[PDB]
A paper describes a structure:
We also uncovered a subpopulation of the CDTb trimer bound to CDTa but note that these particles are present in a significantly lower abundance, indicating the CDTa bound dimer is preferred. Still, we were able to generate a low-resolution map (8.15 Å) and assemble a model of the CDTb trimer bound to CDTa. The resulting structure illustrates rotations of Chains B and C of ~4° and ~9° about the central pseudosymmetry axis when compared to the apo structure, respectively, that allows for interactions with CDTa in both chains. This results in an orientation of Chain C that closely resembles CDTb protomers as they are arranged in the symmetric heptamer. (G) The relative orientations of Chains B and C within the trimeric intermediate shift to contact CDTa, resulting in a structure that resembles that of the assembled, symmetric prepore. Similarly, the reorientation of CDTb protomers in the assembly intermediates bound to CDTa suggests that CDTa may also induce toxin assembly through the stabilization of the heptameric form of CDTb.
Residue numbers in the entry:
A (entry chain Z): 28 to 424
B (entry chain C), C (entry chain B), D (entry chain A): 218 to 315, 319 to 451, 457 to 748
The structure:
Amino acid sequence: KEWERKEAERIEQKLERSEKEALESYKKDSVEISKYSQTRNYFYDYQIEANSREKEYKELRNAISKNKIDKPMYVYYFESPEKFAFNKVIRTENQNEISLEKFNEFKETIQNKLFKQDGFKDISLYEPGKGDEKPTPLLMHLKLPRNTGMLPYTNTNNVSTLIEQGYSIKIDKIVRIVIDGKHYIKAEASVVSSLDFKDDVSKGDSWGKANYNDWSNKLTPNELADVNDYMRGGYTAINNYLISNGPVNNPNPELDSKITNIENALKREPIPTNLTVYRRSGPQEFGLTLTSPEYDFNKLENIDAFKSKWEGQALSYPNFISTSIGSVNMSAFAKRKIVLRITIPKGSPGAYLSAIPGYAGEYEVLLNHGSKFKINKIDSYKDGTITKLIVDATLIP
Amino acid sequence: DLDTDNDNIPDSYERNGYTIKDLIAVKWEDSFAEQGYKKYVSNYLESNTAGDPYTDYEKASGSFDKAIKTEARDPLVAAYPIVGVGMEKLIISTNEHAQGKTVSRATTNSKTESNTAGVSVNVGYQNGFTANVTTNYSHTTDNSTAVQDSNGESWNTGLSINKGESAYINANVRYYNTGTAPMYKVTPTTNLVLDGDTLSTIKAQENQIGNNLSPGDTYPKKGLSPLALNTSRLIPINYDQLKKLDAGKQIKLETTQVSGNFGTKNSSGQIVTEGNSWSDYISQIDSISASIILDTENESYERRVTAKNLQDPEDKTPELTIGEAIEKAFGATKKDGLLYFNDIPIDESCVELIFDDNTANKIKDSLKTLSDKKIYNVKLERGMNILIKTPTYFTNFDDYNNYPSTWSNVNTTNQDGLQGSANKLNGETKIKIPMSELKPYKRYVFSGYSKDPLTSNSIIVKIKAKEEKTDYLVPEQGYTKFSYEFETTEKDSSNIEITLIGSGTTYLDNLSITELNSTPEIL
Amino acid sequence: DLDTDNDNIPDSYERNGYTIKDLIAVKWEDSFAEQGYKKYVSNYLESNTAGDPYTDYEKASGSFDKAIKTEARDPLVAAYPIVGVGMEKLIISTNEHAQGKTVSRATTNSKTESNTAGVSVNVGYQNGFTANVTTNYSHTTDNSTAVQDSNGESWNTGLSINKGESAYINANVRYYNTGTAPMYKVTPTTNLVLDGDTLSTIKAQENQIGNNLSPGDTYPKKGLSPLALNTSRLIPINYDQLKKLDAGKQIKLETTQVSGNFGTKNSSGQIVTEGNSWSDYISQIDSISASIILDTENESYERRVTAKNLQDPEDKTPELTIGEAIEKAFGATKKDGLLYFNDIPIDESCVELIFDDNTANKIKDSLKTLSDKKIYNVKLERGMNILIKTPTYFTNFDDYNNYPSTWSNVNTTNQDGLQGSANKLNGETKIKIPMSELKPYKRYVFSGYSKDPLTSNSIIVKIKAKEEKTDYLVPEQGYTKFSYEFETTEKDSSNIEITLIGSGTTYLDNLSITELNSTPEIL
Amino acid sequence: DLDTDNDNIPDSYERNGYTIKDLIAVKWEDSFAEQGYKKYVSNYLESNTAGDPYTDYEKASGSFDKAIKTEARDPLVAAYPIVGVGMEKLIISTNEHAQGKTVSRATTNSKTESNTAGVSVNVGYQNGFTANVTTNYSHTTDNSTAVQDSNGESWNTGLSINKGESAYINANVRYYNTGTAPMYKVTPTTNLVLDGDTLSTIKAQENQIGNNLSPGDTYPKKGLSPLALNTSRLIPINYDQLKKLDAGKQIKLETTQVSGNFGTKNSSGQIVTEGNSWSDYISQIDSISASIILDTENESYERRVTAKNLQDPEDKTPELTIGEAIEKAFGATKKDGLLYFNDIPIDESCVELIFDDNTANKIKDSLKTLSDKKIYNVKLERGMNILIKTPTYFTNFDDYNNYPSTWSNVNTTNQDGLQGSANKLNGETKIKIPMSELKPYKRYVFSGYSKDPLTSNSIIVKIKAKEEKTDYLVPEQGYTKFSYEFETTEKDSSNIEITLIGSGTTYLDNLSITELNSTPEIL
Ligand SMILES: [Ca+2]
Ligand SMILES: [Ca+2]
Ligand SMILES: [Ca+2]
Ligand SMILES: [Ca+2]
Ligand SMILES: [Ca+2]
Ligand SMILES: [Ca+2]
Ligand SMILES: [Ca+2]
Ligand SMILES: [Ca+2]
Ligand SMILES: [Ca+2]
């Protein structure tokens, strides 16, 4: 723990008054500020501006964005299995042996998949041993890449590492080791970073306009004309055509040419990056109704049914998908309890539709019809007393 | 399932069964006894079940300082080390620099002799007490001197000290450890004591030895040069103690204060021996454990074992007998009613037992309630001292027969022995052990066991030596234990012979000759 | 799928197969042994298979210090450094500041003299024991010096010492490291002794020996001037030991307490030797390893070999034979029953073996159980001492021969030998070995192997030297080893004559001349 | 694309292409070879390609200290420190504090003196080995002393020493660096040895020299006042070595131990030299790297280049020839089949190579499978030494002729030479060289190349000097190297004539006069 303390008092002498005040604020309120940094971006922008913990969040986040490192590191931590989409226990605190079948099922749940890390978190740099806090058998051993936030900071006679994780991790492999007589899972993982904007949306708008100022020039008149029909009112008709299985039941060649033009226009300029985007979804996209008992997430068994029904499955959207780069709550979808957090790899068809002037849309990305989303994580938060879900999904070929 | 201490082992697995395999506790069910494994008991009311700085689990897993001997794997014993200091050659010089009248003599060191120096034997041993009572107790720390290479010559002759001023002394010293623990940062303070008067205290500091003293190893390893006291510098003497070396007295040595460190493995790498002290555990082990010394003629062993006080039902601690405590503290193989080492037989009719006055009184109090008439089925309590003196010669008319001189009239066609057979007699029995293997200026005690299936069959014995002695013994139906003592003289003496004459019906068993101490030399 | 220790090796691989390539550990399948890839073994109970402060895979991968000898990359071979001191020439001067009388004598230093001095020789060797014993065992830490530039003259003539006042002794010393480990913070304490009398001790501290002493080189780098004892400054001497040195005895030097640190990698960048020490591992590694010494006439090595403890099935540690252990600890090319170094061939019928008494007892116990009756196919045990002496001359009527003269009446055209060819005899065999090729005043053993399928075809041999002799050896059906010893004088003497005659049927092989010790010359 | 070490360079770009440009690595296509980037090849298993305290990225990108010579930009050459002491003047003074008698003598220093002193020069060269075998190999650590103003005069006949008390010796020293490493905490030690006898040890401490010693310069900045042995006080001598200094022997001053540090770039600003030193990277370098020395007659250089051991297929280290190793060690411009320094050509025919027994034997053994029979086409191995000496005078019958005199009968109009043109021999070819521009009391060697397109043509070469000689030469169709030595004498002698007479058909080329060592003077 020598290097963590050394860099802790190296950073601490260049931390100013409000930064250090936010540092003791995280020292006394680590869990609450951590969960707030996890779930703050889904509230209203004015809820953010009036939030008491938002000042601490932005001070700590700026400190994380200014204390960087030039080389990748390996760090060890213990985190709940519920945080990494494993909704069961492998071995308990009194249990010390892990059988082959539970190792196999944990392997097949963690295989070939990505898991998000968001918010503030305190992490030790070295492998915990005899007397260190080992609450779970899941020892995550992560390779943080270059230019990633890294804060050694001393609390009383101990030292920890505050970071603002905003990245997904790909667990390359796991092993079963014996520490203090107990079977622990040591997980070698790789950080996969994503272009996520959360609440800062003006600069995301600038990026989309810079990447898509010439997009309307690249489209054919059929494709550009059908897109212009689409955002100005034809989205309702085209989505009603596609959702009701139009080309199969009662095929409309005009609407078939319309959706072909929309797909071609989305295919003209692929997105040059992997993105994290927020779509405000309703119950009908999940085969449910507003009056259905499962929509009321204020009770926990509805969330359990949501986990049992939708986690590990593929969500099919036969219509074009409208997504918003801003996670901020809006008056249009305040009542909706589903905010789908979608990850999109490189080269996918689509467009940032707000680059075209004259549209009153708010930072919208269009996605091709018939898409398949892989459900990965479902967190929860409290918009007031209304319990809402955070469905972190992705785009899969 | 239920846990009390800072240990992983359950309460049921801390009692009447203890098996620790692949760092996992399991109950002993007695099907893996012959596969080299052993069962323990450790306390379920304290993490440190013994006085050592090691809990039961780390001391039973093998997870401790590996320089500690394997005899401390059981949780019963504590890692208690002892520094003893001995001397070999004394040189007397009359200068403060080095020229002068210098005389050099070789002298043998006796570790465990003063504990059994004031012991008296009896012709018949009453009741079931087959031991001897001592008047004082001494550990392996003290070390006595016996001068051997000394022809007829006064010590003042070699120095020519006339009226007022005698010479200076200088010695060759060596350091030994008799204990199952290593110390590194040695701070040995010793005192060169003269029959109640102290000449000098020697501090060997840190540079003369170093930060390494392995358990059971002399500071010069096997055969090298002794460490001279020429590397707090010189020790004087007057013309009052110079003449007291001559007649009866032997100069002794006693270490007083010793401190050190014990190696503790860290979380990742190497053992830390800097931030430590062997001073917070001296009263931790000394006040709770017992003391057992075993004196082999080649080496000495000292052990401390945790026991039970009988007048306290609150303290839930393991209960130990005598023989089980010896087997646990030393490591022994269990033959049919027999406890064996790799070559050393230990039994109530095979070794000499020395007890202090209070412990002998306790045992005589406890020997009444036993219905088996044995000395090893005695419960162990806090605050005893045990001396087990292995005889230098012992026969039992069995597989063990190590006598360099053959007997006479040997009849082994019998079966009414204490173990194996009993020696049938027809007439005399002659033994003639030569001076080539008797150490001069010593005292030897021959003890034996007899049976006699006749009303008034009696025997005579003659110990023909420099001080010969005749004796008349009346054996009984059961096993009677008898002990006789004799001395010897220098190399120019004749062989020592033992003649025993019975009448053809008495039976002899377990005949052992042992050495006790040194006699003063006329000089 | 399963691993145990603080290491990356799987538990299933770690027994009976071990290969490291491109920093991955793969099993051994006996297919790439000729591409420089070799198998090892590792203990799956601890992260440190050896007693080193390094793990087994990391020390078997090369990701550590390169100054260590590369045959120590085997995880079963641990790093063990030894500091030795060697005197080169002696100067005696009568002034403490430096006029007066100053004499100088030229000496040569040898490493294995006291161990060999306790070894006796015999004409024939009974049963499978084809070695001898040493009286006391010592390593190459102590050394013995022999003066070549000393004709007949006493030291008193050039010093003029009458009654008590003597001169001052100065010596030229060098420091060498014969082991597979370095040390940096060298603080050696060395006693200068003569038959027990410790003359003085010297600390070289830091300013004279340097902040490094790499393995494979002494303190002067190849040929430079040796260190003089003028920079703790001088040591005194008296007129009671000079004639002792003059008659038979010699000055020996040995170090006692040596300080030093070991190198290791840091987290990211450089390497640090500040928080390390070669002082807390000695008691760990000597109590867990055996000891092997090899003494070629040019250079010597000594390594510590961990073995398998026999009387514990729980301790799952691999077992070793003798020759496999020697090959892995030193590095020797393995031809068909052949272990060859870069130049020195080592076998059982090519070198000399020195044991102590305990090794002889244990090897006579374990050697009877072998059905092949060979010395090397015996399972190795903990803490056991072996020494190998390379003969200065060895011939076998085969590819190897390093003799000063050419053997007479040689008939190599044979196949009935232990190693291919053997010398068929039809007549006398002669050699005339000169004093131009031999050091003065030494003790030598010529050994050989005689074989004849005939009854009593007796052989006589005459060794004409300064101690000339004749001997007779009868042949046997077995392959019988004979060893003879002799002495010489200063190099102005004639050729040594070796004459031997049988009866033209007997066969001889493996004729080796080796040195043992220095005879005490008369002066 | 795949990266292993902790550097920006991927492993695919760590072999066969390595472009450091604007602090990024990109791939060669052989287009910007004249735009200023030399060949870098680095280990893709080792981040530290060499034993230097740097990764391969930092040393190949300029992100290190400015005082390091830029020749260590290539990752195969390690920045290895060499510190040498130069001798300028000697004074003999009979006092100890500083009236008295004092003489002063001027002394030249020779760096590569003892390395080439054991070079035995034969008249005919075997196979393609155009190099000789030195007996001993020595680097530029030691320095040799030569007296120039050695008029006929005993050193004692003016100093007036009668029996026992000899005078004292003072001198001035300079501290240079021949290598690519700056020393900051310069604390060395050196021995002043006359013909084996050590006189004294000298340490310059820290404040007397300063906090920096750059590569390639001395503490006296070029021509300034030398630092004497006054500001560890004065060096005595006895009445046994003055005749040795006078008659045949010379004072050697050898640097024994070098202690120093370096300054590395921190994250913020300039170098930091507190927590790092030159203490452990020496053995890392010399155990993996060879040693290549250049001695141009103005100044010398030494470099350590990492090499390959053949018995290691996992060792993916770069492999080079001799000439490629020389070019990367020193830096040379490559034209068509030839390499050049700023003014010094480099070839196996222009500058001469010296190897010890191991390197010469390895080059002889490795030349058997080659078909070109050239020196520089030998693969670089570890543990081998190259000493390249540059001739003090060389002509090639071409654009280069540094001979101060003009030859006789030079016929440049020819084309069948190794390089350019050659002299068509017609009759006598003569040159004279004055004694003024040749160093007195030294040994010179003249070497050259001959061809004869006939059967048995012959040349005679007469060297008229103070040992004038005539040598016979029988050339053949193949190219013959001829090399003859002679000794120089004082300035007041005649000139030296080099004459050669042939039949008028042979061809001569590449004539080189070199100084090798200094001859002792009778005094
Ligand atoms: Ca318990
Ligand atoms: Ca317990
Ligand atoms: Ca019996
Ligand atoms: Ca393992
Ligand atoms: Ca291991
Ligand atoms: Ca042979
Ligand atoms: Ca790479
Ligand atoms: Ca690299
Ligand atoms: Ca030519």
